[PDB]
Amino acid sequence: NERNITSEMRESFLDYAMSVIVARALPDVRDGLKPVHRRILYGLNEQGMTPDKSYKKSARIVGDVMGKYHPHGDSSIYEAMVRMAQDFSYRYPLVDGQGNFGSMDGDGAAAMRFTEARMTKITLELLRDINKDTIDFIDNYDGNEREPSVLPARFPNLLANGASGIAVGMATNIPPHNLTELINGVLSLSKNPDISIAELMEDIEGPDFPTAGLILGKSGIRRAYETGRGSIQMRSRAVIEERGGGRQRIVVTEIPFQVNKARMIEKIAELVRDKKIDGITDLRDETSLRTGVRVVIDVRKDANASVILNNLYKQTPLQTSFGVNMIALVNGRPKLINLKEALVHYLEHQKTVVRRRTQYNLRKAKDRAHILEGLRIALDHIDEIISTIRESDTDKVAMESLQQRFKLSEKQAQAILDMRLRRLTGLERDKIEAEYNELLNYISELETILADEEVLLQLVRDELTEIRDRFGDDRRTEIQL
């Protein structure tokens, strides 16, 4: 009962550091998620909060996640869910929110007692096949529930939505990307394991921010994709236009990713006020729901508007850099990874998911066909089946007699005893036969997939292609030069 201070510091600090690293601040390379986000989405899945259903109150979603999966504060959970519903934060939003979910001015969401949420349609693709033994479940924090170690993630979410996180001894900053480009990149990789980063860059041009804007040049992108680290220069979308009486204005319609618009405006106001920038006569945020983002900087008559714009870029967040630092959990450990690595781990995850799903579907189809073979024997000899049951004093005796007389398994005998008399009508008998015939065909299709690795790989391609066609959208961020 004596503790050396040095040993205590080392073990307690390591305990904390390791936990923040593998179970808090860093995303998994396979699904792009940290624990709180995974638990929020799993919670939505388990409470049936699909896009075709009505919005559910946020307080309730949060209460459920806290109880069953996430032993931490309600505010960490709610704020994480809120960001997933912000179209200025997530390139492909994962939560469909109803109500005040915050704004680009740093206004927070309304209290969870007011807002409502459900899954977006793309989130269905993160969860698809989760109940087909595609991913390993683990015990939750108190051993009363089960939770997914990782989501099937049928689209490359790490790269699609990006991630940022501050851990201990390290951090991560992965920018979002265009979904059509990423899937084309995965498809190219799938046809050539030895593809180079430069080759992958014919599909994946660079980041694609939800807030659009511009990226200056490709050297920082290239460095980031090659090594996991690189500086990417982002600029607002700004133009110079006339405003009457020989005067001009600078009009900003897109801002850099993660830049608070109100803050950026106050920074300009502060520079004007302190006379650290010349030529500006007015500053207005004309953003509206109907006009979109619109920040106007009026320029003094005869002043060079282009000079003023270059000055705003040097002195304000109108120009901002994104420091790429691609750290993710790979096999449960933090790893700095390049673009190809990120895609390789994602692709392997997809192959495993689709293989496991195919194996699961085969087991369940064989089980069900076995049951239907039992029901078909019962229909073929219904008079005898009835006599056998009627002569039997108990269920146990009837079970044994059915197994003995009709060479049935215990599962088949129990299915026959469970069959309702309505199943004996013409339509119901035909349904039993039709389901069986369809099932034999389905079993044949599954066996083909499992017998040939190229057929499986091709199925992965086809499913990715379908997702690309349904959810892929245009590039927003312009890469200049």
Partner: protein, 192 residues
């Protein structure tokens, strides 16, 4: 005011200030409004009942002070209509019984400290749709379309038609004598 999200125009004749219950409603209102002519002032919950409070308490209350500063008219004897920063002061409480209560508290304050603002027809009551626990439950476009868009909104202009009757109504409903308020409830309550 720190909480005031003012409009661009400085021409009072065309500007409107919307009074909402807090930041939950303020965020939706801020995003949906027309920032050129519509200012928003989120207010911190149940408003001080000025009919029950003495002057020192009233003048030191943060929400009261915000409203006075934002309207720019001064108060009581020093009220100057000509200095009104908005020609429409719009009460936009949440669509619940508590929002109705907040509305009575706000009207009490305007009636006792800014009566000419009411007499001039500058005080309005917004009509957000029912079925929402608060404006923070509404999307910004729904709030704009149903409640703030002048092309579709239905604002109620508050009218003072008999001052003696209004004085008695404010004293009875909002004053310190419980018995008269109990009597009013008993005489008017329809439990159906």
């Amino acid at each position: 005011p720190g909480k005031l999200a003012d409009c661009s125009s400085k021409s009072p004749e065309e500007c409107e200030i919307f009074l909402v219950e807090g930041d939950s409603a303020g965020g939706s209102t801020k995003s949906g409004r027309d920032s050129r002519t519509q200012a928003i002032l989120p207010l911190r919950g149940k408003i001080l009942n000025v009919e029950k409070a003495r002057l020192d308490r009233i003048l030191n209350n943060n929400e009261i002070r915000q409203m006075i500063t934002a309207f720019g008219t001064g108060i009581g004897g020093d009220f100057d209509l000509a200095k009104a920063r908005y020609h429409k002061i719009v009460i936009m409480t949440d669509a619940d019984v508590d929002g109705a209560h907040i509305r009575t508290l706000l009207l009490t304050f305007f009636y006792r400290f800014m009566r000419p603002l009411i007499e001039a027809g500058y005080v309005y009551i917004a009509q957000p749709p029912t079925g929402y626990k608060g404006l923070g439950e509404m999307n910004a476009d729904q709030l704009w379309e149903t409640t703030m868009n002048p092309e579709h909104r239905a604002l109620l202009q508050v009218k003072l038609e008999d001052a003696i009757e209004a004085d008695q109504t404010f004293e009875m409903l909002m004053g310190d004598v419980v018995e008269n308020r109990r009597q009013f409830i008993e005489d008017n309550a329809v439990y159906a």
